[PDB]
Coordinates of C-alpha atoms in Angstrom, one line a residue:
Chain A
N1 CA 37.8 21.8 -24.3
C2 CA 40.1 23.7 -21.8
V3 CA 43.7 24.2 -21.0
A4 CA 45.4 22.2 -18.3
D5 CA 48.0 24.7 -17.0
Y6 CA 50.3 22.4 -15.0
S7 CA 52.5 25.3 -14.0
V8 CA 50.2 25.5 -11.0
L9 CA 49.0 21.9 -11.1
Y10 CA 52.3 20.4 -10.0
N11 CA 51.9 23.1 -7.3
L12 CA 53.9 23.5 -4.1
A13 CA 54.0 19.8 -3.7
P14 CA 56.3 18.7 -0.8
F15 CA 57.4 15.8 -3.1
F16 CA 55.9 15.4 -6.5
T17 CA 56.9 12.0 -7.9
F18 CA 56.7 13.1 -11.5
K19 CA 58.6 10.1 -13.0
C20 CA 57.4 10.6 -16.6
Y21 CA 58.1 8.7 -19.8
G22 CA 57.7 9.6 -23.5
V23 CA 58.0 13.4 -23.0
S24 CA 60.1 15.8 -21.0
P25 CA 58.2 17.0 -18.0
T26 CA 58.4 20.6 -18.9
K27 CA 57.4 20.4 -22.6
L28 CA 53.7 19.8 -22.4
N29 CA 52.3 23.3 -22.6
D30 CA 53.2 23.7 -26.2
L31 CA 51.8 20.2 -26.9
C32 CA 48.2 20.1 -28.3
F33 CA 47.5 16.4 -27.8
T34 CA 44.1 14.7 -27.5
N35 CA 41.8 14.0 -24.6
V36 CA 43.0 13.1 -21.1
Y37 CA 41.7 10.8 -18.4
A38 CA 41.8 11.3 -14.6
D39 CA 41.7 8.7 -11.9
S40 CA 43.3 8.3 -8.5
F41 CA 43.5 6.2 -5.4
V42 CA 45.7 5.7 -2.3
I43 CA 48.5 3.2 -1.8
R44 CA 50.6 2.2 1.2
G45 CA 53.9 4.0 1.3
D46 CA 56.5 1.3 0.5
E47 CA 55.1 -0.1 -2.7
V48 CA 54.6 3.3 -4.5
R49 CA 57.5 2.0 -6.6
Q50 CA 55.8 -1.4 -7.1
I51 CA 53.3 0.2 -9.5
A52 CA 55.1 0.9 -12.8
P53 CA 54.8 -0.1 -16.5
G54 CA 54.8 -3.8 -16.9
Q55 CA 56.6 -5.3 -13.9
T56 CA 55.4 -7.9 -11.4
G57 CA 53.7 -7.1 -8.1
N58 CA 50.7 -8.2 -6.0
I59 CA 49.0 -4.8 -6.4
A60 CA 50.1 -4.7 -10.0
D61 CA 48.5 -7.9 -11.2
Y62 CA 45.4 -7.9 -9.0
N63 CA 44.2 -4.2 -8.8
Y64 CA 46.0 -2.0 -11.3
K65 CA 48.3 -2.7 -14.2
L66 CA 50.2 -0.2 -16.4
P67 CA 50.9 -0.8 -20.1
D68 CA 54.5 -1.0 -21.3
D69 CA 54.0 1.6 -24.1
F70 CA 52.3 4.1 -21.8
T71 CA 52.3 7.9 -22.5
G72 CA 51.9 9.8 -19.3
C73 CA 52.9 9.4 -15.6
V74 CA 51.8 9.7 -12.0
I75 CA 52.0 12.0 -9.0
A76 CA 52.4 10.8 -5.4
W77 CA 52.7 12.6 -2.1
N78 CA 52.0 12.2 1.6
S79 CA 48.7 12.6 3.3
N80 CA 49.3 11.0 6.7
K81 CA 47.8 13.8 8.8
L82 CA 44.6 14.0 6.8
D83 CA 43.9 10.3 6.6
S84 CA 45.3 8.4 9.7
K85 CA 43.4 8.6 13.0
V86 CA 44.5 8.0 16.6
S87 CA 42.4 4.8 16.7
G88 CA 43.3 4.1 13.1
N89 CA 41.0 4.6 10.1
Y90 CA 39.8 1.3 8.5
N91 CA 38.4 2.3 5.1
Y92 CA 41.0 1.4 2.5
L93 CA 41.4 -2.1 1.1
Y94 CA 42.6 -3.9 -2.0
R95 CA 42.0 -7.3 -3.6
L96 CA 43.8 -10.3 -2.3
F97 CA 43.2 -13.5 -4.2
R98 CA 42.5 -12.7 -7.8
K99 CA 42.9 -15.9 -9.9
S100 CA 44.3 -14.0 -13.0
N101 CA 46.6 -11.2 -14.1
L102 CA 44.3 -8.3 -14.9
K103 CA 45.2 -6.5 -18.1
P104 CA 46.1 -2.8 -17.8
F105 CA 43.2 -0.3 -17.9
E106 CA 40.2 -2.5 -17.4
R107 CA 37.3 -2.2 -14.9
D108 CA 37.0 -4.9 -12.3
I109 CA 34.5 -4.5 -9.4
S110 CA 33.2 -7.5 -7.4
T111 CA 32.3 -8.4 -3.9
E112 CA 31.8 -12.2 -4.0
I113 CA 33.9 -14.3 -1.6
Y114 CA 36.8 -16.0 -3.4
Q115 CA 36.9 -19.7 -3.8
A116 CA 40.1 -21.7 -4.5
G117 CA 38.2 -24.0 -6.9
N118 CA 38.3 -27.8 -6.4
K119 CA 35.3 -28.2 -4.1
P120 CA 32.2 -26.0 -4.4
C121 CA 32.4 -24.0 -1.2
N122 CA 29.1 -22.5 -2.3
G123 CA 29.3 -19.2 -0.3
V124 CA 30.1 -20.7 3.1
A125 CA 33.5 -19.1 3.8
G126 CA 35.1 -22.3 5.1
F127 CA 38.3 -23.9 3.9
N128 CA 39.7 -22.8 0.6
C129 CA 36.8 -20.3 0.4
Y130 CA 38.2 -17.0 1.7
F131 CA 36.8 -13.5 1.8
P132 CA 39.4 -11.2 0.2
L133 CA 40.5 -7.6 0.7
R134 CA 42.0 -7.4 4.2
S135 CA 41.7 -3.6 4.8
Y136 CA 44.6 -1.6 6.1
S137 CA 45.0 0.1 9.5
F138 CA 46.7 3.5 9.0
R139 CA 48.0 3.8 12.5
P140 CA 48.4 7.4 13.9
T141 CA 52.2 7.1 14.0
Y142 CA 54.5 4.8 12.0
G143 CA 57.4 5.0 9.6
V144 CA 57.4 5.8 5.9
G145 CA 57.1 2.1 5.0
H146 CA 53.4 1.7 5.8
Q147 CA 52.4 5.4 5.6
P148 CA 49.4 6.6 3.6
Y149 CA 50.6 8.2 0.4
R150 CA 48.1 9.9 -2.0
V151 CA 48.8 9.1 -5.6
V152 CA 47.1 10.1 -8.9
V153 CA 47.6 8.3 -12.2
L154 CA 47.4 10.4 -15.3
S155 CA 46.8 9.0 -18.8
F156 CA 46.3 11.0 -22.1
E157 CA 45.7 9.6 -25.6
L158 CA 47.5 10.5 -28.8
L159 CA 47.0 10.7 -32.6
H160 CA 46.3 14.4 -32.4
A161 CA 43.1 14.3 -34.5
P162 CA 40.7 15.1 -31.7
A163 CA 42.6 18.2 -30.4
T164 CA 41.2 18.4 -26.9
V165 CA 43.3 20.3 -24.3
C166 CA 46.4 22.0 -25.7
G167 CA 47.5 25.4 -24.4
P168 CA 48.5 28.7 -25.9
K169 CA 49.7 30.7 -22.9
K170 CA 52.8 32.9 -23.4
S171 CA 51.1 36.3 -23.9
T172 CA 53.5 39.2 -24.3
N173 CA 53.0 43.0 -24.4
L174 CA 52.5 45.4 -27.3
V175 CA 54.5 48.2 -28.9
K176 CA 53.7 50.6 -31.7
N177 CA 55.4 52.8 -34.4
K178 CA 58.5 50.5 -34.4
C179 CA 59.6 47.7 -36.7
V180 CA 58.7 44.4 -35.0
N181 CA 57.7 40.9 -35.8
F182 CA 54.1 40.0 -35.1
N183 CA 52.5 36.7 -34.4
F184 CA 49.0 37.9 -33.3
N185 CA 47.1 34.6 -33.9
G186 CA 49.5 32.3 -35.7
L187 CA 50.2 34.4 -38.8
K188 CA 53.7 35.8 -38.8
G189 CA 55.3 38.8 -40.5
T190 CA 57.4 41.9 -40.1
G191 CA 56.4 45.5 -40.2
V192 CA 55.1 48.5 -38.2
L193 CA 51.9 48.6 -36.2
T194 CA 49.7 51.8 -36.1
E195 CA 46.1 52.9 -36.1
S196 CA 43.4 52.5 -38.7
Chain B
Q1 CA 24.0 -19.7 6.0
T2 CA 26.0 -17.3 8.2
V3 CA 24.8 -16.6 11.8
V4 CA 26.1 -13.8 14.1
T5 CA 26.5 -15.0 17.7
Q6 CA 25.8 -12.6 20.6
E7 CA 25.5 -13.0 24.4
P8 CA 21.9 -12.7 25.7
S9 CA 22.3 -10.2 28.6
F10 CA 24.8 -8.6 31.0
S11 CA 24.4 -7.1 34.5
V12 CA 27.0 -4.6 35.6
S13 CA 27.0 -2.2 38.5
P14 CA 26.9 1.6 37.8
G15 CA 30.3 3.2 37.2
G16 CA 31.9 -0.1 36.1
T17 CA 33.6 -1.2 32.9
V18 CA 32.0 -3.8 30.6
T19 CA 32.5 -4.9 27.1
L20 CA 30.1 -6.6 24.6
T21 CA 31.2 -9.2 22.1
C22 CA 29.9 -9.9 18.6
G23 CA 31.5 -12.5 16.4
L24 CA 31.1 -15.1 13.6
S25 CA 30.7 -18.8 14.3
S26 CA 31.4 -19.7 10.6
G27 CA 34.8 -17.9 10.6
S28 CA 36.7 -14.8 11.6
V29 CA 35.5 -11.3 11.5
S30 CA 37.5 -8.6 9.7
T31 CA 37.2 -4.9 9.6
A32 CA 36.0 -5.3 6.0
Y33 CA 32.8 -6.7 7.3
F34 CA 32.3 -3.2 9.0
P35 CA 31.2 -3.9 12.6
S36 CA 28.6 -1.4 13.8
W37 CA 26.9 -1.1 17.2
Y38 CA 23.2 0.1 17.5
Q39 CA 21.0 0.3 20.5
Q40 CA 17.2 -0.3 20.6
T41 CA 14.8 0.9 23.3
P42 CA 11.6 -1.2 23.2
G43 CA 8.6 0.8 22.0
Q44 CA 10.8 3.2 20.0
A45 CA 13.3 3.3 17.1
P46 CA 17.0 2.5 17.5
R47 CA 19.9 5.0 17.6
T48 CA 23.2 4.9 15.8
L49 CA 26.1 4.7 18.2
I50 CA 29.3 3.1 16.7
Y51 CA 30.3 2.9 13.0
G52 CA 33.7 2.5 11.3
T53 CA 34.8 0.2 14.1
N54 CA 36.3 3.2 15.9
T55 CA 34.1 6.2 15.2
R56 CA 31.1 7.6 17.1
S57 CA 28.0 9.1 15.6
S58 CA 27.2 12.8 15.7
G59 CA 26.4 13.7 19.3
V60 CA 27.4 10.3 20.7
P61 CA 29.5 10.8 23.9
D62 CA 33.1 9.8 23.8
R63 CA 32.5 7.5 26.7
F64 CA 31.5 4.8 24.2
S65 CA 34.4 3.3 22.3
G66 CA 34.5 0.2 20.0
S67 CA 37.2 -1.9 18.3
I68 CA 38.0 -5.4 17.2
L69 CA 39.1 -8.1 19.6
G70 CA 40.5 -11.1 17.9
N71 CA 37.7 -12.4 15.6
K72 CA 35.0 -10.8 17.7
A73 CA 33.7 -7.3 17.4
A74 CA 34.1 -5.5 20.8
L75 CA 32.5 -2.3 22.3
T76 CA 34.0 -0.8 25.4
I77 CA 31.5 0.5 28.0
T78 CA 32.9 2.3 31.0
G79 CA 31.1 4.2 33.8
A80 CA 27.6 2.7 33.6
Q81 CA 24.6 5.0 34.1
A82 CA 20.9 4.4 34.4
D83 CA 19.9 5.1 30.8
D84 CA 22.5 2.9 29.1
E85 CA 20.5 -0.3 29.8
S86 CA 18.7 -1.3 26.6
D87 CA 18.8 -3.7 23.7
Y88 CA 22.0 -3.6 21.6
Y89 CA 22.7 -4.9 18.1
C90 CA 25.8 -5.6 16.0
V91 CA 25.9 -5.2 12.2
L92 CA 28.1 -7.2 9.8
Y93 CA 28.2 -6.8 6.1
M94 CA 28.6 -9.5 3.5
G95 CA 29.2 -9.1 -0.3
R96 CA 26.5 -7.0 -2.1
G97 CA 23.5 -6.8 0.0
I98 CA 23.8 -9.5 2.6
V99 CA 23.8 -7.9 6.1
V100 CA 23.3 -10.1 9.1
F101 CA 22.5 -8.8 12.6
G102 CA 23.2 -10.6 15.9
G103 CA 20.9 -12.1 18.4
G104 CA 20.5 -8.8 20.4
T105 CA 21.8 -8.2 23.9
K106 CA 19.8 -6.6 26.7
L107 CA 22.2 -4.6 28.8
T108 CA 21.3 -3.8 32.4
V109 CA 22.6 -1.7 35.3
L110 CA 22.7 -4.9 37.4
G111 CA 20.4 -4.0 40.2
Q112 CA 19.4 -0.3 40.1
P113 CA 16.7 0.3 42.8
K114 CA 15.1 -3.1 42.6
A115 CA 11.3 -3.3 42.9
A116 CA 9.1 -6.3 43.3
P117 CA 6.6 -7.0 40.5
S118 CA 3.0 -6.1 41.3
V119 CA 0.3 -8.5 40.3
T120 CA -3.4 -7.7 39.9
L121 CA -5.6 -10.7 38.8
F122 CA -9.3 -10.0 38.1
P123 CA -11.8 -12.6 36.9
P124 CA -14.4 -11.5 34.3
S125 CA -17.3 -9.4 35.6
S126 CA -21.0 -10.2 35.4
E127 CA -21.6 -8.0 32.3
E128 CA -19.0 -10.1 30.4
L129 CA -20.8 -13.3 31.4
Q130 CA -24.0 -11.8 30.2
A131 CA -22.4 -11.4 26.8
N132 CA -21.2 -15.0 26.7
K133 CA -17.5 -14.0 26.8
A134 CA -14.8 -14.3 29.4
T135 CA -11.3 -12.7 29.8
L136 CA -9.0 -12.6 32.8
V137 CA -6.4 -9.9 33.2
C138 CA -3.2 -10.4 35.3
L139 CA -1.0 -7.3 35.0
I140 CA 2.6 -7.2 36.1
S141 CA 4.4 -3.9 36.9
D142 CA 7.4 -2.6 38.8
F143 CA 9.8 -5.3 37.7
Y144 CA 13.3 -5.3 36.1
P145 CA 14.6 -6.7 33.9
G146 CA 12.1 -8.1 31.3
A147 CA 13.0 -11.8 32.0
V148 CA 9.5 -12.6 33.2
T149 CA 7.7 -16.0 32.6
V150 CA 3.9 -15.7 33.0
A151 CA 1.9 -18.9 33.1
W152 CA -1.7 -19.8 34.0
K153 CA -3.2 -22.9 35.5
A154 CA -6.9 -23.8 35.6
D155 CA -7.6 -25.4 38.9
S156 CA -4.5 -27.7 38.9
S157 CA -3.8 -27.9 35.2
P158 CA -1.6 -25.4 33.4
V159 CA -3.1 -23.8 30.3
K160 CA -1.0 -22.6 27.4
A161 CA -3.6 -22.3 24.6
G162 CA -5.6 -19.0 24.4
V163 CA -3.2 -17.3 26.8
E164 CA -0.4 -14.9 25.7
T165 CA 2.2 -12.6 27.4
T166 CA 3.0 -9.0 26.6
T167 CA 6.6 -7.7 26.2
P168 CA 7.6 -5.6 29.3
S169 CA 7.5 -1.8 28.5
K170 CA 9.3 1.2 29.9
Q171 CA 7.7 3.0 32.9
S172 CA 8.2 6.6 33.9
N173 CA 10.4 5.6 36.9
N174 CA 12.9 3.4 35.1
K175 CA 11.1 0.0 35.5
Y176 CA 9.3 -2.5 33.4
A177 CA 5.6 -3.4 33.3
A178 CA 3.6 -6.0 31.3
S179 CA 0.3 -7.8 31.4
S180 CA -1.3 -11.2 30.9
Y181 CA -4.6 -12.1 29.2
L182 CA -6.6 -15.3 29.6
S183 CA -9.4 -15.4 26.9
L184 CA -11.6 -18.4 27.5
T185 CA -15.4 -19.2 27.6
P186 CA -17.6 -18.3 30.5
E187 CA -18.6 -22.0 30.9
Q188 CA -15.0 -22.9 31.7
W189 CA -14.8 -20.0 34.1
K190 CA -17.9 -21.2 36.1
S191 CA -16.9 -24.8 35.8
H192 CA -13.5 -24.3 37.6
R193 CA -13.0 -23.8 41.3
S194 CA -10.3 -21.1 40.9
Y195 CA -7.9 -19.5 38.5
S196 CA -4.2 -18.7 39.3
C197 CA -1.6 -16.4 37.7
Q198 CA 2.1 -17.2 38.3
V199 CA 5.0 -15.0 37.2
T200 CA 8.7 -15.9 37.4
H201 CA 11.1 -13.0 37.4
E202 CA 14.8 -13.2 38.2
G203 CA 14.3 -16.2 40.5
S204 CA 11.4 -14.6 42.4
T205 CA 8.1 -16.2 41.9
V206 CA 4.8 -14.4 42.6
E207 CA 1.4 -16.2 42.9
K208 CA -2.1 -14.7 42.7
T209 CA -5.3 -16.7 42.8
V210 CA -8.9 -15.6 42.2
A211 CA -12.2 -17.6 42.8
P212 CA -15.1 -17.4 40.4
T213 CA -17.5 -18.3 43.3
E214 CA -16.6 -15.1 45.0
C215 CA -18.0 -13.0 42.1
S216 CA -21.3 -14.8 42.4
Chain C
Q1 CA 15.0 19.0 8.7
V2 CA 15.7 15.4 7.8
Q3 CA 12.6 13.3 8.5
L4 CA 10.9 10.2 7.0
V5 CA 7.2 9.7 7.1
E6 CA 5.9 6.1 6.9
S7 CA 2.2 5.6 6.0
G8 CA 0.0 2.8 4.7
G9 CA 0.5 0.5 7.6
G10 CA -2.4 -1.6 8.9
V11 CA -3.8 -5.1 9.2
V12 CA -4.5 -7.0 6.0
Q13 CA -6.0 -10.3 5.1
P14 CA -3.4 -12.8 3.9
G15 CA -3.1 -13.0 0.1
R16 CA -3.9 -9.3 -0.6
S17 CA -1.6 -6.5 -1.6
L18 CA -0.7 -3.1 -0.2
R19 CA 1.7 -0.2 -1.1
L20 CA 3.8 1.1 1.8
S21 CA 4.4 4.8 1.4
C22 CA 7.5 6.7 2.6
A23 CA 7.9 10.4 2.2
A24 CA 11.3 12.2 2.7
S25 CA 11.6 15.8 3.8
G26 CA 14.8 17.9 4.0
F27 CA 16.7 16.0 1.3
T28 CA 16.2 14.2 -1.9
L29 CA 16.0 10.4 -2.0
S30 CA 17.9 10.4 -5.3
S31 CA 21.1 11.3 -3.5
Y32 CA 21.1 8.6 -0.8
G33 CA 20.5 4.9 -0.5
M34 CA 17.3 3.7 1.2
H35 CA 16.6 0.7 3.4
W36 CA 13.6 -1.2 4.6
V37 CA 14.0 -3.1 7.9
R38 CA 11.2 -4.8 9.8
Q39 CA 11.1 -5.7 13.5
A40 CA 8.7 -8.1 15.2
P41 CA 7.7 -8.2 18.9
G42 CA 9.7 -10.6 21.0
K43 CA 12.3 -10.8 18.1
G44 CA 15.3 -8.9 16.7
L45 CA 15.4 -6.7 13.6
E46 CA 15.2 -8.5 10.3
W47 CA 16.5 -7.0 7.0
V48 CA 14.0 -6.9 4.2
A49 CA 15.0 -4.9 1.2
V50 CA 17.1 -1.9 0.0
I51 CA 17.4 0.5 -2.9
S52 CA 20.6 2.2 -4.1
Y53 CA 21.0 5.9 -4.6
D54 CA 21.0 5.4 -8.4
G55 CA 18.6 2.4 -8.6
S56 CA 20.8 0.5 -11.0
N57 CA 20.7 -2.6 -8.8
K58 CA 18.1 -4.0 -6.5
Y59 CA 18.5 -6.6 -3.7
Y60 CA 16.1 -8.5 -1.5
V61 CA 16.4 -11.2 1.2
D62 CA 15.7 -14.8 0.2
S63 CA 12.5 -15.0 2.2
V64 CA 10.9 -12.1 0.2
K65 CA 12.1 -13.1 -3.3
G66 CA 9.5 -12.9 -6.0
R67 CA 6.7 -11.4 -3.9
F68 CA 7.6 -7.8 -3.0
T69 CA 8.8 -4.9 -5.2
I70 CA 10.4 -1.6 -4.2
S71 CA 9.9 1.7 -6.1
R72 CA 11.1 5.2 -5.8
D73 CA 9.8 8.6 -7.0
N74 CA 12.3 11.4 -7.4
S75 CA 9.7 13.9 -8.7
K76 CA 7.6 14.2 -5.6
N77 CA 10.3 12.8 -3.2
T78 CA 8.2 9.8 -2.2
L79 CA 9.1 6.2 -1.7
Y80 CA 6.8 3.2 -2.3
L81 CA 7.0 -0.5 -1.3
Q82 CA 4.8 -3.1 -3.0
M83 CA 3.7 -6.0 -0.8
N84 CA 2.1 -9.1 -2.3
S85 CA 1.0 -12.5 -1.0
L86 CA 1.0 -11.5 2.6
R87 CA 1.3 -14.1 5.3
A88 CA 1.0 -14.2 9.1
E89 CA 4.8 -14.1 9.6
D90 CA 4.9 -10.6 8.1
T91 CA 3.4 -9.1 11.3
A92 CA 6.1 -6.7 12.3
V93 CA 7.1 -3.0 12.5
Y94 CA 8.9 -1.7 9.4
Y95 CA 11.5 1.1 9.5
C96 CA 12.5 3.0 6.4
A97 CA 16.2 3.7 6.7
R98 CA 18.5 6.1 4.9
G99 CA 22.1 5.1 4.1
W100 CA 25.2 6.8 2.9
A101 CA 25.5 8.7 -0.4
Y102 CA 27.5 9.1 -3.6
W103 CA 28.3 12.5 -2.1
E104 CA 30.9 10.6 -0.1
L105 CA 32.7 8.0 -2.3
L106 CA 32.7 4.7 -0.4
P107 CA 33.8 1.3 -1.7
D108 CA 31.4 -1.4 -2.9
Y109 CA 28.8 -3.3 -0.8
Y110 CA 27.7 0.2 0.3
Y111 CA 27.6 0.8 4.0
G112 CA 23.9 1.4 5.0
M113 CA 21.6 3.1 7.4
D114 CA 22.4 5.7 10.1
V115 CA 19.2 7.6 10.6
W116 CA 15.5 6.7 9.9
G117 CA 11.9 7.6 10.7
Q118 CA 9.6 6.3 13.4
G119 CA 8.3 3.6 11.1
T120 CA 4.9 1.9 11.0
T121 CA 3.6 -1.5 12.2
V122 CA 1.8 -4.0 9.9
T123 CA -0.1 -7.1 10.8
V124 CA -1.4 -10.0 8.6
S125 CA -4.5 -11.4 10.2
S126 CA -7.4 -13.4 8.8
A127 CA -10.4 -11.2 9.7
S128 CA -12.5 -8.3 8.4
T129 CA -13.9 -5.1 10.0
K130 CA -15.5 -6.4 13.2
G131 CA -17.4 -4.5 15.8
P132 CA -15.4 -4.1 19.0
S133 CA -16.6 -5.7 22.2
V134 CA -16.0 -3.6 25.4
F135 CA -16.5 -5.1 28.9
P136 CA -16.1 -2.9 32.0
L137 CA -14.0 -4.2 34.9
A138 CA -15.8 -3.5 38.2
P139 CA -13.8 -5.0 41.1
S140 CA -15.5 -6.3 44.3
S141 CA -15.4 -4.4 47.5
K142 CA -12.6 -6.7 48.7
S143 CA -10.2 -5.3 46.1
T144 CA -11.2 -1.8 47.1
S145 CA -10.2 -2.4 50.8
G146 CA -7.2 -0.2 50.5
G147 CA -5.9 3.2 49.7
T148 CA -6.1 2.7 45.9
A149 CA -8.6 0.8 43.8
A150 CA -8.0 -0.3 40.2
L151 CA -10.8 -0.4 37.6
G152 CA -10.5 -1.2 33.9
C153 CA -12.4 -2.0 30.7
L154 CA -11.8 -5.2 28.7
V155 CA -11.9 -4.8 24.9
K156 CA -12.2 -8.0 23.0
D157 CA -12.3 -9.3 19.4
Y158 CA -11.8 -5.9 17.9
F159 CA -10.7 -5.7 14.2
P160 CA -8.8 -4.2 12.6
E161 CA -6.3 -3.2 15.4
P162 CA -5.3 -0.9 16.9
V163 CA -8.4 0.6 18.8
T164 CA -8.1 3.9 20.6
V165 CA -9.0 3.3 24.2
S166 CA -9.4 6.2 26.7
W167 CA -11.0 7.2 29.9
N168 CA -13.1 10.3 30.4
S169 CA -12.1 11.4 26.8
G170 CA -8.6 12.2 28.1
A171 CA -9.8 14.1 31.2
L172 CA -8.1 11.7 33.5
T173 CA -4.4 11.0 32.9
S174 CA -2.8 10.1 36.2
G175 CA -3.2 6.4 37.1
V176 CA -4.4 5.5 33.6
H177 CA -2.4 2.7 31.8
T178 CA -3.3 0.5 28.9
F179 CA -1.9 -2.9 27.9
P180 CA -0.7 -4.3 24.6
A181 CA -2.9 -6.7 22.7
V182 CA -2.3 -10.4 22.6
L183 CA -3.0 -13.0 19.9
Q184 CA -5.9 -15.4 20.6
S185 CA -6.8 -18.8 19.2
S186 CA -9.0 -17.3 16.5
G187 CA -6.4 -14.6 15.6
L188 CA -8.2 -11.6 17.1
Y189 CA -6.8 -9.3 19.8
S190 CA -7.8 -8.3 23.3
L191 CA -6.7 -5.4 25.6
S192 CA -7.6 -3.8 28.9
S193 CA -7.2 -0.2 30.1
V194 CA -6.9 -0.5 33.9
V195 CA -7.0 2.8 35.7
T196 CA -5.6 3.1 39.3
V197 CA -7.4 5.7 41.4
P198 CA -7.7 6.3 45.2
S199 CA -10.8 4.8 46.8
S200 CA -11.9 8.3 48.1
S201 CA -12.8 9.5 44.5
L202 CA -15.5 6.9 44.0
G203 CA -19.1 7.9 43.8
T204 CA -18.6 11.7 43.3
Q205 CA -16.6 11.1 40.0
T206 CA -17.6 8.9 37.2
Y207 CA -15.0 6.9 35.1
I208 CA -16.2 6.1 31.6
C209 CA -14.2 3.9 29.2
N210 CA -14.2 5.8 25.9
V211 CA -13.2 3.6 22.9
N212 CA -13.2 4.6 19.2
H213 CA -12.9 2.1 16.4
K214 CA -12.3 4.3 13.4
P215 CA -12.4 1.7 10.6
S216 CA -15.8 0.5 11.9
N217 CA -16.9 4.0 12.9
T218 CA -18.4 3.2 16.3
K219 CA -18.4 5.1 19.5
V220 CA -18.8 3.2 22.8
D221 CA -18.6 5.1 26.1
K222 CA -18.6 2.3 28.7
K223 CA -19.3 3.6 32.2
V224 CA -17.0 1.8 34.6
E225 CA -17.9 2.0 38.3
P226 CA -17.7 -0.5 41.2
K227 CA -20.6 -3.0 41.3
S228 CA -23.6 -2.1 43.4
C229 CA -24.0 -5.7 44.5
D230 CA -26.1 -5.2 47.7
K231 CA -26.0 -8.8 48.7

């Protein structure tokens, strides 16, 4: 129940990776589609391409997958100055040894130490029983390959029955005592406008 | 079960550089386990010093710096001063609620102005005997650090039951003080020729002896 | 200002129950995680139990499973801990600790504890309210053959601990020092308050060992002076 005016949302982005599918990036204001979902995280610089609809990848099959017939797209940019520290900030971390290919758009939160099966390691963290994640470093200076990039994934539904966001915009001026077409609130016609 | 291994105690001259180590004997330590360094002064509550493996708490001087060294959590301590000597703790995090602390390390300033422990042994008074009770006090003060071993011997036989030692406590002049209590029966006190109180501290042994016959 | 008040501590017979009370001022406990950590004399700190900011999940250490319960009150900003089936190993000092918040989104296995209150000590001893025994310490003239003479007052088999021991009702402060209690064979404590004073102040001034046992409501003012053993 609001309008998402992306004319300012794409903003003065230094580089907005608006690689979008299913719709032209400019023709969304006139669309009146259903509800939208918001979620975001941060990924190391090189594999920003590695996340995409339905291709292989360690980050893709273990932490976040994207459906093939996906409506929507993502935005990514650089936040090296705000995130990285001189000593290196160690707060960001991703799963390492998931024994499955997680389906797109499902919740998966867990902290138990991974076991390679076979023998019951039983929470000892010995052989074949490894603690996953292996958090990043985010060194104060490095190339674009392992540079912190802030990315947001955007997904909106369809079927148009629960009209949720939409947007009217495009408000023009007014004239009087002249023949002119009027579209005040959806109704259309031709005539002259005066007082009453 | 997992156990965190820590060194018992260090001794470093003022103005020097020392590092403390905290690791895991069951495997390697990663930054995901979130090493944290906390200091405890006996008789009070601890203070937060190092968290995030590289970040200091609000108001913590930049002189303290921590990092990871191989599979052992490391804290860098340069330019020792008098007040830095205290108990220190390392914090490691397991999955969903399991946090294991280390064995604790008592940091020292090596020597400071060293002072010999002071002993005062007093056998029970006549009023205590009149109440059919007996208790000997052997206080120790002006010693550093707290590695003190207080033992009692009746005549020529050491006694361990009924006797306990107190943890050394901070003084107002940067020094430690403790005490010893020997709670026995008056009959044992009057049936023994003498009572002795021995304290071992940093390789220096102090002996004090009292005689029940003197009080009579 | 951020402060945590810990109350309800004391000495309890084994097998009974008690509710530890923790009050938070300056913030709301609903916004932050809360921790309970105990520490015993001669030992290191020992983790006991925590509560999350939302309370959806609760965790305890294996040694305390099935005996203790933690509860929180957002209405009055008060925190309660339920203790049941107490045993002698529970004698320690508990600290109520405040962790990070949902106000700063952190990953799972939430990072805990940065600031906390003074805490309160608890002891599990097998005794009941017992009259304290106070014995003055009057040294012989041999021990007074110096610039300074030390006198004290032994306090024995007092329960429940602690007992407030003082000299001259706080009039004398310099040279006054008390000692921590020790465990005996029967499980009761004993302490001494030895006061160091110069030998020139004897006679003219009187040193009285003032002790108060609030649970038993007794007042003993033991006069401590060197013995007049004219023999």
